[PDB]
Amino acid sequence: AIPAHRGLITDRNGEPLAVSTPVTTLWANPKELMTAKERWPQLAAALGQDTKLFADRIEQNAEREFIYLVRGLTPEQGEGVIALKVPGVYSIEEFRRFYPAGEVVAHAVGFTDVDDRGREGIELAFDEWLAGVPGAKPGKTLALSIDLRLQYLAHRELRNALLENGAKAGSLVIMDVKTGEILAMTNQPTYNPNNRRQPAAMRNRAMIDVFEPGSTVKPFSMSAALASGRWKPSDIVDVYPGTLQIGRYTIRDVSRNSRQLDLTGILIKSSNVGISKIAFDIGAESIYSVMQQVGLGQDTGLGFPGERVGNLPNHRKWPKAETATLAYGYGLSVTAIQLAHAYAALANDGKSVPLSMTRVDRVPDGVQVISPEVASTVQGMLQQVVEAQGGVFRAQVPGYHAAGKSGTARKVNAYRSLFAGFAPATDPRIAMVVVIDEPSKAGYFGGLVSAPVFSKVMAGALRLMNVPPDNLP
Template identity: 35%
Template sequence: MRPPAVLRLGNPGRRINVGLIAMTFVLSVFAGRLVQLQGLDSKVYAAEAAEQRVRGEKLTARRGSITDVNGHELALTLEAREIFVDPSEVAPADRDRVATVLAAELNQPKEQIAAKLGNTTSRYQQVAAAVEPSVAQRIMTQKPKLKGVGSKHRYRRDYPGGDLAGTLLGFVGDDGTGLSGLENTYNGLLAGRDGEQFIETGREGQRIPMTRSTLKTPVEGRDVRLTIERDIQWAAQKAITDQVKATGARTGSAIVIDVPTGQVVAMANAPELDLKNWEKTAPEDWVNRSVTDVFEPGSTNKVITAAAALESGAVRPETVFKVPDNIRCADRVLRDSHPHPVERLTFSGVVATSSNVGTILASQRVGDEKLHAMLERFGFGAKPGTGLLGEEAGLLPEWKKWSGSQRCTIAYGQGVSVTALQTASVYQTIANGGVRVTPQIVAGTTAENRAFVPSPPGKQTRVISERTAREVSGMLEAAVSDEGTGNLAAIDGYRVAGKTGTAMRYDPKCQGYCGYTSTFVGFAPADKPRLVVLAVIQDPHKGYYGGEIAAPVFKKVMTFALKSKKIPPTGTTAASVRIRAGE
């Protein structure tokens, strides 16, 4: 019989030794890992953890203001708040309430906000870019709290005048970048430099106390001070807008320039751009037509022909011309504005009565090359130099390429093209004794220390002699007399010099000449000029002569500007100008 089996237990000491070895191995693995994590790789993991906690935020710089010459703000920056939602934080049962409150406070469609709340794959949905701080406070203090709704500090651009100087000032986009006008031209200076802040936050986005933060302070934008005077700008804008509406015209522009300095006191366009609702306006209406739209100047250009004739010595103011009502130039017969028998007009009378034929006769004594040179000296074919967005140079064909009829029509302003500002600059030159001053629109800017830095004076260029300027001024004063074409521009108590312009208007839509450009430009007081005012109206449908359509605008704007700047009459009497021979 076999003995019963005996269960033999292992050696206890050996089991203990094996267990200790196993434990030692496991602990050594853990220890090695701890050494790796806390020693060798600690900085790497710490950096990754910090990166997950650190949140960067752009600190938007406050945009500088644009003011008129007296410091009245035309464009300024106000405090605002952005309202946003985190759809993942809004419980489905709360969405209707959140959408209802936000829609009421922000004046937005409830359905639009509800759609953003329903986008649960997103952690951020902007509801409003810039609202009043008081509105944001009401939203953020709702009872019970609107979970998932937040606000951020922002700025918003405001234009107190609405459409006052709208196309000149321009506007900024939602990101604060200037998109048109001076806001675009001076964007780099106005915008300043954004700052940045980094902070450590917890899982719910709250800042962790006593943790590090990095701050790069934003640098505020600098201010731009214009040469514009707010009240005169308003008067010019109203006058040109009213006349464009009254005549059924397409567009219009009015400009006021200070004669000695060349500074632009007003630059108005009609229709003007409402800066509070610029998004509703077609992009083609964002432009400043005073410097972008080119047109044939018509009879306002006759002063350049007159200056060329006087400078060359070919004629004197009292030189007599036998002027029929038509003249053949190459293959065309060119006519005066109305039929008349042959008249014996002095050269002063030719300008005062705005005779096309008389002007052609004078230009033939000058010659094409000299007339072209004079047009160039007055700034034709070159940008005026303000630096405004979209500033055009117009069109001045090379004299050797003038056609047979152009040799005549250019003398009275057909066959060349200019902008409203170029035309105003011509008359500033004559009023300033023959010295052209580059037009200025910016009086100066502020430095980073907020001190005002004036712009350098406009460049001065002698264009014609003082004597020629004085003689042309006398002719222009006669043009505003009872016998001249610009008598509706006369202002009681003041001596006024000016010129009408009525030009056929080239229109790409009809692929030819259709409609008219009506202009009046002049200065006052005529014997001591202080201000130039130009009014140009494009494609009027109720009348079209410059003396009827544009001269009344000149009178309204000049009268207001003279009073606003407290410029008194000189108290002198205009010298008698002989218009017809034998008088």
């Protein structure tokens, strides 16, 4: 059968990301080869094979009318073999993929197996569209949501942060909050898909690795508090003395020099005690509902085989310890894609637009998952988290009002450093998640390790997208 030309993958502006390259496959009729044994050695040497092992193979297939000699020669190598003019040697034009951006977008684009079928990423997810039909009809062009310009920036900054932090791994996702598009998705470690010759390096961690989101979910606990009718931002919580006992469990703040904190101060000081006390007052049910509605631990609908769903704990009757730990993101499992999608809903005034890895021309209707008034109040609080005295100043994006939240998880001393946010605050365009796994220098807090990567990637992304600076007089 005649292998078909696989569809071109492009970025959202038409830059090529996966291109079908002509190769030559050689096959032989042994019955005819066996009439030309004197030609075999120069045919073996032309295929870089030992004369004796080549000869053994043909002799062991003397009564098969077909065998492959080699697959995936360049046309030039295949020409050299054809020019030997060996009886019983034939050629087929096959296709191998080339990935012009290589390691930069390897996890998103994926790659094809020996037979030119998708094995990972978009190549796998859109195989039916890309493949076409073997004779023979060509596969179809696919434009991704990815902007190669934002992807290059995200890739470079996440690489530099891993090296500066001596970290094991990392992910970074950028989303268009208005369209649901994935504009960048990068992971470390990465691989060159044009030279496969580590399984670890091939993992799209942003989609297939789950982690505890920790304190990055506090904005969703606060959304539930503001929607309950029992809380406003200027309300106070007494978090003294920085700890709270629930039977056997102790809730702890890292900084314990607080008594009265307003709701914004609970976020600035990442007080687990403060969010736990609000959680006890409003009930875990309300918080669970917000987290489920923004898609934490829920199917993204992206249909990448091997994509993880994670898990959001649920109860009929929430025990007090589980109520506290839900509200500060302990014992949840989410993906970086889910966390970025949730932040996009908050940024898009509480409307969730379905996630897309393909370029969106006609934007589907969004679902109102949080009330626009609550969403807008939480945005303003997350802007104070970044800008306020004592805030996460390393997330500040010079030129723009940015907003977001740090997290730091102790794994089970190894850490995960998180920052999730959006910008600009006065009409958000972009949501971003930065996850750095096991930073190994003195700093491991999300506000130290991930927040500066957010700042640098957001500064470039907003400028690459010509977003007008909103920090004006």
